[PDB]
């Protein structure tokens, strides 16, 4: 459990560092573009 917990703390610290340092606002702009693309396919399905 001590060896496992030390690797879990390394993975959690790595996961925090990635989301904290590099979770940039542009990823939410890409998610808004993906949602807008999904709405355009629903409008194409409605048109069909």
């Amino acid at each position: 459990f001590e060896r496992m917990e030390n690797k879990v703390l390394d993975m959690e610290a790595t996961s925090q560092a990635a989301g904290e340092l590099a979770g940039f606002g542009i990823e939410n702009q890409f998610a808004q573009l993906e949602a807008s693309s999904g709405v355009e396919d629903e409008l194409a399905a409605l048109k069909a």
Binding site: F1, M4, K7, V8, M11, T14, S15, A18, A22
Partner: protein
């Protein structure tokens, strides 16, 4: 009764650790793919 409890404890401990090790390895592999795409890709693109 001590043998029945001992085998149950060993079996549960090993299987919980093994699945935690597998999920930790999968999680760090997914994180490392973000590190290579972020670190190598944006540097190569910016240099081009």
């Amino acid at each position: 009764r001590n043998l029945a409890a001992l085998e149950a404890k060993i079996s549960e401990a090993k299987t919980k650790k093994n699945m935690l090790q597998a999920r930790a390895k999968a999680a760090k592999a997914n994180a490392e793919l973000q590190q290579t795409l972020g670190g190598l890709g944006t540097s190569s693109a910016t240099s081009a």
